[PDB]
Paper text:
The viral type II topoisomerase encoded by the African swine fever virus (ASFV) is critical for viral replication and infection, thus representing an attractive target for antiviral drug development. Type II topoisomerases can relax supercoiled DNA by a concerted strand-passage mechanism in which the enzyme first cleaves one DNA duplex (G-segment) and then guides the second DNA duplex (T-segment) to pass through the transient breaks. ASFV P1192R contains two conserved domains, namely, an N-terminal ATPase domain and a central DNA cleavage core followed by a coiled-coil arm, but lacks the nonconserved C-terminal domain (CTD) with modulating activities reported in human topo II. Similar to previously reported topo II structures of yeast and human, P1192R assembles into a large homodimer mediated by two interfaces.
Interestingly, 3D classification revealed two distinct classes with almost even particle populations, generating high-resolution reconstructions with C2 symmetry imposed at an overall resolution of 3.16 Å and 3.13 Å, respectively. One state has a closed conformation in the C-terminal dimer interface, and the other one appears open. In our study, two distinct P1192R dimeric states were observed simultaneously in the cryo-EM samples, with their DNA-gate closed, whereas their C-gate is closed and open, respectively. In the open state structure, the interface of coiled-coil arms separates by ~17 Å, comparable with reported C-gate opening structures, thereby displaying an opening C-gate conformation. It shows that the conformations of the DNA cleave core for the two P1192R dimers are nearly identical, with a root-mean-square deviation (RMSD) value of 1.25 Å for all Cα. Compared with the yeast topo II, P1192R contains an additional pair of E817-R1046 salt bridge, which is retained in the closed state while disrupted in the open state. Comparison of the open states of P1192R and yeast topo II showed that the distance of the C-gate gap is nearly equal; however, the coiled-coil arm displays a 15° rotation between the two structures. In addition, we found that the open state of the P1192R, yeast, and human topo II shared a similar opening distance (~17 Å) of the C-gate, while differing in the conformation of the coiled-coil arm. Since no DNA substrates are present in the cryo-EM samples, we consider that the C-gate could adopt both closed and open conformations prior to reaction, and its status might be self-regulated through inter-domain interactions. The N-terminal ATPase domain comprising amino acids 1–414 was invisible in both states, probably owing to its flexible connection with the other part of P1192R.
Numbering used by the authors:
A (entry chain A), B (entry chain B): 415 to 470, 502 to 1192
């Protein structure tokens, strides 16, 4: 066996007292070696006397060879279990879903499939290392939480976190030397035995069996965090049910694996694309100066917590800036300066990231993704730092607005962009109260039927879109020269690369028989392929390929027909996988999220306006009464605060009121009334004049007018923010038109 | 032929009028297609009528197949040349040294080797695209420079560059659409024919022949930029000699390729390591907070212009923070928090960059690499932006202070760290004027002989270092248990990974015969390997391996001896490759650079102190004379400046004097006397009081005292800055001792 360190007592008289520390990889093996050889100033801790190490079906073959397990044995009795070389096997995997969810899950499935009696009687354990450590100022011993729920509960009991620094250890390689010493000093109090319950068999069959339907049904919903009672019981008896592990960690790992290929139906982008968009918004906010692709990728990795390889990051950055006929992005996020790709190679002929540059399409991103609503979306947190939002909610349904296809395997995703005019008409009819077939559209939405039509986008396509049965076909255009006998292909079908199409024709002998030569003089955007045929071949070509209503004889000969198959599989905002049948369902699912976002924006604006009005009124009152109060004579802040409280001045938080970044409306109303009176003592000398008071009065008047406008907006029919939604739709349409006029180079 | 687009007239009556645009890759092919199909609003420009395209010995086989060249032909006559299908072949390669230096160089070598008459008579051309474009404000047409020397000469003639924006196009993929249109509008004025001269044959033989000695001799020196006369002649006759291209572009490409594996002898780090160190200094300057490896790599890529893959960046970041026995860095730049690697796998068992964190060893970096001297080193510029310095000059010879080895192939580099005490003694004896054997050391340096000894570092090595002949051998330590018959290896030789050593023993059958089992219970830092031998094997082992003075019988049996071979090949500061024989030569070469750096630091400090003294004296004079002058009554700045000039107030530059970042002493003395009188009108109201004047007088006194101290320092024997050098050496020694005491975790 390779990478196996046997214990001194393994396989001997005290073999049942031994342990086998199954390490995830090389880092886990290094940590285990450091802990086991630490037994110099550690009499109570473990050592190599009873603890062995191994690195994690050849690996499983080595595992069974070391443990001395028997395939034909059941280990239902103690005498049969005593033949094992080791008392128990302990898996040392990182707390991240990639390691504990996959490797430990596979090991548990293996053991359950072959030797379950070991699992029920107790043979498999796991190394539960502290997930989160909170260090105080002046206190050496930290507070350790094994789950994020426990840390959240503890932080709910903390008045302030200024004196506490929080460190997340999601991998075994994140533990420092003294932290490793601390964990291995209490090694016996940190191993957890796995147990089998009634639902464990069904969960194992679902997550590791050959039935894909059960797996898809189980993965339809999200991952539920462990209930505090379950966590408390686990910490109490030091036993972890297999069902809980399979339902939480394995499900999270599988959902994360799917989420890397399947986009959300609200914004149409995956996690990597959302990170790239957030990094682009943050990076180009100060100035829209051009930056190289690798520099922007480094910025995204540094700020947006993009821990994957830079190759995929650069590829996605290049794809987000591509703009050519048949490209994935009809409205790309970034303006690309340089050679970012051509339709002939399907965007695979892009320049090196060291040369091409990216810029933020501010006039489009600002309108499609409002900055005001960016403070209201739920954000994902990576090691306690605010990363990109969980999902973006654009003004228009960007999920169905662009060409989408999954190049990988394991999940089929393919969407064809719908027409901009049809989508705009549908959304405007839904939103506008004074619009034909508005009530009819709402009634149809309630009964889930379609009234207004949705058609595939015909932009950047000089072909023909036809409907046959329930399918949509795209036909390229060609012109034939009888005198020259050659055929000039002028337009390929939708999203058909030129080089791949030419090679596909060249790979067929039946078509190669009638074709003598193929030359590609197509421009960067316009296709022009000359196919020189053998003499006297038109009649033979017509006879070989009979003409039908579905397609022409030459169209069949040259394969100038493409089928628009759509696979509408998306990720729900609260986790899980959702399957749609038509784009109407996607639009109907996206609409309520945007309506709720508009309502939330209006409500938070109302709350912040009320707080600012209160602050300004208090400031004006203090300005008026400073002559009689004479607060400038006092020195201490406490005396001034007490006299202001006696006079009735309300206490407000300066920072939260003036900078309400990410505070929810209930949170904003909760913690804004426990501030101080700093806003009064911080007033400038020039601000005590009559002119400053008049300016503040004018500001109060304009803010009050905005408050009445917001209040009137909140009562708008059918839902609040309808006029704002229509205005933003008009702005987005204008930005899209301007981008299309200038080839998405806004100048 | 693949990726070949034939011209309409190629191989016909007008075949000699045709062209073959040899594209470097896919991006070049896309640019060529865009340019050639652009001929709609471009009657004068080229098109596919006479221009073909091809993608760049199978590729060369396709090239000769397309061109119809003959291997047995010489093409010495026009009639033989007329058989060619194309009139000429034009190479479209990016201006960067990777593309034009390698691919174009290989094509030129191919043509010279087989068909030189084509080269002399004129058959190979290159596409010379504008390297640098300067855009003015309000002027659409830019200024194009094909070489960096031309741009530098033009900028020397520019009074100000505020209205000019500079763009560098080092790749064919960096040209925008309108720029591509501009270049292809004047296509006939941008192709350059290659010519052969007398030295071309020798240069081709040197750079592409089988004689490695000639290549090494040629690469000993750096790359000389083309002289302005040569560039002017090239632009005049539109012909490029092959010798000039080989001497500049190919030499630069080869030197850059070598520089990625061979470190400088001044700081001991390559380009990537210098970029990482500069990024670490810049990133952790504000606060020394821990950052993840991938986040720091992204920061380095964004700011230090690291355009290579992130895998190598993360690997180098991890290596720079590793600290274990036998590691490459005896004094690592970064403190690593987490599991950064172990000696058992030779640092290959490091944790994932997503988990481990890095911090800047400020107490060591600040002392070893002074921040004051960081403004004086020559910096490399990447696309006009200031990247990491060309070379660092540490206080101590870091090139010989750490274990260095080149893991790649093509250049043999291996250095073994010398003892800290010996290096400190040598440098102190060189610097200190009152020191035994100081004059003797200087005399020996003049005669290039050694007096003080240099020995390999024995730190973190519980073995034996022995000297035999001119070689140094490292022996591990073992203990034998006769009763147990097993052998306990306690220390492996220097820089010998444990796993590799165990596998090497296991791979030999002769040693495997006497060994029954091998167990590795070694700690993270201490080696303890138990080798259980077969019964009655000590006598057989002794008989098989005879004992000699060089090594013991058991040492030969277990291969516990390592030879300390050193390959001292480095990169000179001004380019080229330098070969050393002993570490004394490296120290003697490094010393004058540090002495010159100290002298430059002292001189620039003197100049800036003089300028600041002049500024402060002028300010004090204005404060004294403001009562009579009454400058506050005036409104315009011009009138005040004129009256101050009449009164004799000197004009100084506020920004340059107060922030002399990277201004050389001659440059500082040149452009600091053409400023304005802003420093007088910008004075605060509170600064006109007597207390402010007294504070300024005290500041003037302290600055004058520092000026006299600097002046006395400049006259110090033997060279200026000797006491400063000794103080910095003492500080570096203290920092190294503190780091070694705390396992390079400064706390």
């Amino acid at each position: 066996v390779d990478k196996y360190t046997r214990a001194r007592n393994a396989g001997g008289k005290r073999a049942q007292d031994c342990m086998l520390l199954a390490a995830e990889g090389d880092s886990a093996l290094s940590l285990l070696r450091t802990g086991l050889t630490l037994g110099k100033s550690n009499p109570s801790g473990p050592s190599f006397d009873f603890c062995g190490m191994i690195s994690l079906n050849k690996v499983l073959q080595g595992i069974v060879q070391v443990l001395g397990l028997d395939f034909n044995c059941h280990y239902k009795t103690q005498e049969e279990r005593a033949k094992l070389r080791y008392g128990c096997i302990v898996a040392c995997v990182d707390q991240d879903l990639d390691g504990c969810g996959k490797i430990l899950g596979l090991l548990l499935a293996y053991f359950h499939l072959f030797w379950p009696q070991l699992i029920i009687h107790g043979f498999v354990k796991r190394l539960l290392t502290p997930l989160i450590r909170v260090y105080e100022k002046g206190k050496t011993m930290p507070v350790e939480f094994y789950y994020e729920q426990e840390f959240d509960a503890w932080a709910k009991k903390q008045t302030s976190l200024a004196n506490h620094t929080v460190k997340y250890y999601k991998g075994l390689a994140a533990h420092d030397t003294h932290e490793v010493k601390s964990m291995f000093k209490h090694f016996d109090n940190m191993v957890y035995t796995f147990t089998l319950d009634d639902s464990a068999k069904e969960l194992f069959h679902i997550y590791f069996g050959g039935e894909s339907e059960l797996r898809k049904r189980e993965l339809c919903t999200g991952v539920v965090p462990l209930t505090e009672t379950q966590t408390q019981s686990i910490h109490s008896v030091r036993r972890i049910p297999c069902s809980l592990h399979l339902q939480v960690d394995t499900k999270a790992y599988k959902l994360d694996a799917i989420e890397r290929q399947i986009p959300n139906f609200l914004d149409g982008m995956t996690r990597a694309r959302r990170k790239i968009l957030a990094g682009g918004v943050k990076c180009f906010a100060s100035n829209n100066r051009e930056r190289k692709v690798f520099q922007f990728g480094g910025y995204v990795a540094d700020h947006m917590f993009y821990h994957h390889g830079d190759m995929s990051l650069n590829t996605s950055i290049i794809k987000a800036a591509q703009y050519y006929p048949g490209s994935s992005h009809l409205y790309p996020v970034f303006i690309g300066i340089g050679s970012f790709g051509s339709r002939h190679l399907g965007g695979k002929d892009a320049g090196s990231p060291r040369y091409i540059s990216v810029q933020l399409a501010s006039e489009f991103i600002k309108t499609m993704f409002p900055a005001e609503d960016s403070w209201l979306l739920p954000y994902v947190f990576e090691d306690g730092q605010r990363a990109e939002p969980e999902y973006y909610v654009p003004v228009l349904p960007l999920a169905i607005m662009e060409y989408g296809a999954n190049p990988s395997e394991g999940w089929k995703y393919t969407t064809w962009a719908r027409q901009l005019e049809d989508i705009l008409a549908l959304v405007r009819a839904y939103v506008d109260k004074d619009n034909p077939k508005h009530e009819l559209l709402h009634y149809a939405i309630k009964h889930k039927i379609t009234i207004l039509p949705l058609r595939p986008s015909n932009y950047n396509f000089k072909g023909h879109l036809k409907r046959f049965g329930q399918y949509y076909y795209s036909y390229g255009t060609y012109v034939i020269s009888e005198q020259r006998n050659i055929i000039t292909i002028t337009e390929l079908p939708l999203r058909v690369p030129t080089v791949a199409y030419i090679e596909s024709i060249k790979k067929s002998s039946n078509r190669m028989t009638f074709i003598e030569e193929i030359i590609d003089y197509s421009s960067s955007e316009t296709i022009e392929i000359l196919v020189k045929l053998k003499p006297n071949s038109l009649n033979r070509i017509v006879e070989e390929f009979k003409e039908t209503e579905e397609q022409d004889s030459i169209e069949n000969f040259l394969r100038l027909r493409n089928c628009l198959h759509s696979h509408l599989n998306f990720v729900k905002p609260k986790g899980g996988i959702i399957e749609f049948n038509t784009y109407y369902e996607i639009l109907y699912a996206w609409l309520p999220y945007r309506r709720e976002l508009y309502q939330k924006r209006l409500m938070r604006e109302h709350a912040v306006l009320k707080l600012r009005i209160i602050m300004e009124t208090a400031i004006v009152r203090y300005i008026n009464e400073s002559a009689e109060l004479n607060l400038s004579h006092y020195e201490d802040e406490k005396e001034a605060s007490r006299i202001l409280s006696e006079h009735g001045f309300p206490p407000l938080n300066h920072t939260l009121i003036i900078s309400p970044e990410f505070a929810s409306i209930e949170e904003l109303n909760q913690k804004a009334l426990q501030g101080c009176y700093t806003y009064i003592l911080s007033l400038q000398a020039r601000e005590l004049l009559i002119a400053a008071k008049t300016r503040r009065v004018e500001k109060i008047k304009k803010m009050q007018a905005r408050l009445d406008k917001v209040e009137q907006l909140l009562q708008e029919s059918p839902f609040p923010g309808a006029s704002v939604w229509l205005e933003e739709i008009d702005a987005v349409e204008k930005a899209i038109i301007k981008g299309r006029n200038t080839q998405w180079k806004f100048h």
